Symmetry: D2
Subunit: 179 residues, 4 copies
């Protein structure tokens, strides 16, 4: 009785959070995918990163796109001391590339450091966040895009992030190659 209730409860919270997100996120998902499509078109790449339950999201986004029957898109997750991402971005990133930075709270020291490295290399940033945006939100420059899930709950934020990413991939293919 309680367990079936709790399940229904979590399902409905997940669904309600997505309906809220539906009202506020589409313009930001559109701008991000556009920023990404323009970078690819100019022979740039996308580097993605995230901490913990966001790390899978960075690699899900990238593998989808890199490993393909549309053309392989140059999208690489960084993987494998808050400098782990930042150093790879300095090694790999060139002007006009795009950083996808994923953090449910926006407080990841190493994603914050990632965003500085991306700015130093003249890259645009697509930031996937939740809650109040955290420290990352405040570090975004005017040309950067923020996709902020309207929720405080870590697990609902993650659920909308997966969806957001699936939206970005889909809009990237439609814009580049066509429906």
């Amino acid at each position: 009785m309680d367990m079936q209730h709790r399940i229904r409860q979590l399902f409905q919270a997940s669904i309600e959070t997505k309906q809220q997100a539906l009202e506020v996120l589409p313009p930001y998902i559109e701008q991000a995918s556009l920023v990404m499509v323009n970078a690819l078109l100019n022979e740039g790449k996308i580097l993605s990163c995230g901490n913990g339950g966001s790390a899978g999201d960075a690699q899900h986004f990238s593998s989808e796109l890199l490993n393909r029957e549309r053309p392989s898109l140059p999208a690489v997750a960084l993987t494998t001391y808050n400098e782990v991402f930042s150093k790879q971005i300095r090694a790999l990133g060139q002007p006009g590339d795009v950083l996808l930075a994923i953090s449910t709270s926006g407080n990841s020291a190493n994603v914050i450091q990632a965003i500085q490295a991306a700015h130093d290399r003249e890259m645009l940033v697509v930031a996937l966040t939740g809650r109040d945006g955290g420290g990352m939100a405040s570090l975004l420059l005017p040309e950067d895009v923020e996709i902020r899930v309207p929720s405080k709950i870590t697990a609902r934020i993650q659920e909308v992030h997966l969806l957001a990413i699936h939206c970005l991939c889909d809009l990237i293919d439609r814009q580049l190659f066509g429906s």
Copy 2:
């Protein structure tokens, strides 16, 4: 591009979770009792999956292991890649959490067989028609099949389903 297309993807996501809500909860409940059972009997949970399911396997385990008290859940961390590790680490009673969008991942199929040889129970997160994984399941195993043929929809529901399992285990062992 199209906001209209974004709303459309969001609406499709919502609709599948609604379809999933009408069919999955009793299985989600079963799996969780199976997992709480094994953990109370001093056992453990191993998880696995390929493609867009590997992260889910890790996300489940490292919630429970790393953090509440830590719970013995380990993700198999790389067609006998998983099967070999189950043989080595599995003990009678343990649970395998196996995740696949198609039900056709050859190494998770061999993961399921290895778990059976260990006298382990299997919880299978699947979609579509359940593939070769469904046909391997024994009566005491639990399928959680997403009523969708679309990979991206199954993945979205699989993450919700994994969040539920975690929640129900903590609910039963610790309470709320």
Copy 3:
């Protein structure tokens, strides 16, 4: 002169190995019997390392378990992959009589030290691959544990002798179990 330096590095590598040859073989033999005894008693080997010692740990377990380069039976050797990430996996997976292969070049890795503690707590024996003079962790070992301490302070030379030592461990395990 770059030639002078290469031939100096090769000689330092050869010379460390020669001095390793004078202290190590008893401890390699003892380490391997411990591992063989555990496996014959239906046990398993868990292995762990940090930094450059981390390939070593994976290489050890990958070798025996997957058998990608030689055709003999698979052995339950498993590499482990926040000072508690190793501790917590050992606690979750280790059963009494199991063996931990613990690798580091300094002997000071916080997690590997805590891996040792988690191994003893689970009534496991430890084979410890170290260099320098073992320092800590090498002071945590109990009478039935085994240390293989490279007679060197140079990280690179220690890595080199570790790889050889692991190759000796795997080889004698097979030699004792399959002749």
Copy 4:
């Protein structure tokens, strides 16, 4: 201790020692040459990509992680990155090389036999991006060696024994890093 095991341990030590002594007599010119191509690439604002299969993968990641992260040693970070795997699958390296590689960059490619299809394909991808290749190999060099253009460098360990090739590879990698640091940051 018991004789056989003591015999086996000491015979392996001796074979490792003897393989290194043989390697010493033929590898230095190619090791120097390799480190020169790497240094020249970095001086021209290049980067190094590394890859390897099975037991070589560790070497690949060891090389680039030391150079880039600088845990073990406090000197400047160098743009050296290991190519990942983790979820046909023979294109995992080449797909990344085509995304990340630039004209002038260097691929350090590691294989003991030289026949792994994904490293063979990595070499092609590097060539298509106008990158130079440093190939750590053994035995006869395999298919990999057959693909090397004249600006490339091969470091072929003079052994047919996997374990022996792996040990010399680790040494080669330690020399390359030493030589890169010497040339850039002082002997």
